[PDB]
Amino acid sequence: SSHKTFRIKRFLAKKQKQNRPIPQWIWMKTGNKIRYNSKRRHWRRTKLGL
Binding residues for RNA, rule: CB under 7 A, are 1-23, 25-44, 46-50
* Min separation Cβ 42 and RNA, Å: 5
CA–CA dist 28, 43 (Å, integer): 31
Which DSSP helix (H) or strand (E) runs through 6?
A: helix 6-17
Number of residues that this document lists for the chain = 50
* Min separation Cβ 21 and RNA, Å: 4
* Min separation Cβ 19 and RNA, Å: 5
